[PDB]
């Protein structure tokens, strides 16, 4: 917001009015060029004078001219270089006031174990193989698997499917259908979306706003048909990491590793990264039911955690509260929430 604008305004001072391509050292280059030109002119004049001298208010001007040339040249060069040095040393007093107040590396706690760096090197392999496969010179149909294995690195059997995906997508990008049609017509699964894709690309067979709406559909229906993924398991994780910084720094500044368990400060993040596993909070003791202490239903059609149940009843005496019409452990059952 304010920092970015106050940064661009300070940075533009490196350039002249053109905003581009005319940096400050052009002054020094121009001055040295002019100095050389002046010496060349003086050389020509002196040569002519001596040549015509072969059988005075002239020399007493050329010598002074040489003196004047050297004074102007060195004075101007020194002044310009001094100004550019001072400007470069003053831009630090605006790249320093802001960008040196965070110390990103101070947040690295719970260090990622040094033994598991192959798994990171497989997640990276998958992300490169998925999001950015077509933007590489590969070549033949199968003489590119060796190139992948040789330059970057190869993942598990989830590379053949991505080679085929990249091939068909790139072929379809060049306005040459009749291969995606064959692919769609060979896999006959859910008929509905496949037929919709067939119709969309058939419409494409009859533009710049249509390709971007057909490649995406084919990508979705290929990923959902060969059972792999649609978003990399690394991109979502980097997203959540980018979202948790603000809350972490807020907690850090309130405070002035953590109980070997649940980290504090209850970061909140958008829905489409939260609708995976259902999280339930006990209504009587206020604790998230874990693998141990699993929730029970108590014949009143309520849900309470098991530990709270076993402190509501010592060993399970008929004490039946929660509709005061509950009952003890002859009519209670285990539950597991599935986000179908």
């Amino acid at each position: 917001s304010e920092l970015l604008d106050s940064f661009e305004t300070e940075f533009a001072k490196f350039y002249t009015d053109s905003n581009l391509e005319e940096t400050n050292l052009q002054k020094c280059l121009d001055h040295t060029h002019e100095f050389k030109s002046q010496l060349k002119k003086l050389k020509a004049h002196l040569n002519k004078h001596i040549q015509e001298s072969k059988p005075k208010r002239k020399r007493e001007l050329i010598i002074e001219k040489l003196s004047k040339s050297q004074r102007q040249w060195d004075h101007s060069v020194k002044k310009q270089i001094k100004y550019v040095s001072q400007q470069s040393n003053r831009f630090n007093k605006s790249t320093l006031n802001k960008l040196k107040e965070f110390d990103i590396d101070s947040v690295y706690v719970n260090k990622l174990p040094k033994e598991t760096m192959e798994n990171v090197n497989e997640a990276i392999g998958y992300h490169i193989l998925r999001y950015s496969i077509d933007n590489m010179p590969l070549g033949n149909k199968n003489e590119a698997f060796q190139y992948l294995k040789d330059v970057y690195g190869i993942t598990n059997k989830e590379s053949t499917e991505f080679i085929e995906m990249g091939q068909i997508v790139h072929d379809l990008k060049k306005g040459d259908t009749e291969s995606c049609l064959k692919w769609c017509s060979n896999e006959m699964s859910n008929h509905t979306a496949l037929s919709s894709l067939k119709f969309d690309l058939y419409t494409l067979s009859a533009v710049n706003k249509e390709l971007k709406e057909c490649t995406s559909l084919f990508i979705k229906e290929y990923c959902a048909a060969k059972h792999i993924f649609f978003d990399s398991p690394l991109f979502l994780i980097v997203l959540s990491g980018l979202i948790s910084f603000q809350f972490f720094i807020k907690y850090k500044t309130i405070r002035e590793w953590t109980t070997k368990d649940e980290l504090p400060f209850d970061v909140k993040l958008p829905d489409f990264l939260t609708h995976f596993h259902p999280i339930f909070i006990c209504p009587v003791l206020k604790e998230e039911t874990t693998t141990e202490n699993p929730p029970y239903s108590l014949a009143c059609h309520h849900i309470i955690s098991k530990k709270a149940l076993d402190r509501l009843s010592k060993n399970g005496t008929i004490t039946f509260k929660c509709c005061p019409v509950n009952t003890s452990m002859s009519s209670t059952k285990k539950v597991r929430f599935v986000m179908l």
Partner: protein, 358 residues
Amino acid sequence: KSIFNEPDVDFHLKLNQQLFHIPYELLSKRIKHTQAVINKETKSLHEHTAALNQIFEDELALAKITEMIRKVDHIERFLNTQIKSYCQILNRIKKRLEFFHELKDIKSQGTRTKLIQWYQSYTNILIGDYLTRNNPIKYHWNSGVVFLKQSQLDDLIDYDVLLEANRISTSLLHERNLLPLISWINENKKTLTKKSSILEFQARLQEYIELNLLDDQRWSVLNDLFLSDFYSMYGISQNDPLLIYLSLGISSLKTRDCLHPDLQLFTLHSLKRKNCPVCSETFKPITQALPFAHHIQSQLFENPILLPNGNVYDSKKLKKLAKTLKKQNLISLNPGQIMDPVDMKIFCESDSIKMYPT
């Protein structure tokens, strides 16, 4: 006024300020060199023209002026090289500036996907700068350099300072530990010793020598010391940002049950648990040794249903999945039947119990 939760653009700059320092030191070295060159040549030219002024007070003047020209044009070419390097560094910073200006424009304006694309770019820029750091050199080029070149974003990551560090730190640990590190000290003894850091000392002792004082681990400690001084000189923030982001993200969505112990395939992909990034197939070893989560709000699906299998699902999603399985001819159902995904089974409609989760 964020879109969903992304922080203000003032925060990303402070997040990765190493992108605005390692070009700056490169920029300042240029001026600190091109000032010394002028201060060394200006006195030379002055003392040289003193000779001509003395000589006037004899056609040697033409010779002297010719020598003057032959000296000045060298300065001209030198300044030409310096300007064509200075302009390139300026361009390098300006590209990274407009990169964030793009995010500011997006954030001041559906558009969710127009921001997901930006985060795709922000993730590639970062996988590249982690790969070009620790991956053995081929000859010099790495996998990171290839990725940066072939993702059309070579400007936004240096890939030569990091590569230089990788070269030095792999020569100090391989190739019989042949050391070009002295070739790095000798070009940087003016500013390193102003800090008064003990690097020339350890390098000299190791050079002399080649039982801790004779052990191998002195190689490792020497490497660590060089990395410390290099990073503190430039500003490279000695922890892979990819590692930082993973170490928080994986512990931010590791909820209370992620490591919970033809028709079957469709059923067991119809769930919404076989998508969780943290417990998928290759992040389990990463996520074993990390904390879980903190939440002060029980979020749950709206209208739950219990059936004799022991687990509670939903009221409508089961109906829609039953109809879907009906319209694809995988199973044989009947008016009131219902199907359970986990441990596939068919239960009557009246073996269904409503639940009220407080």
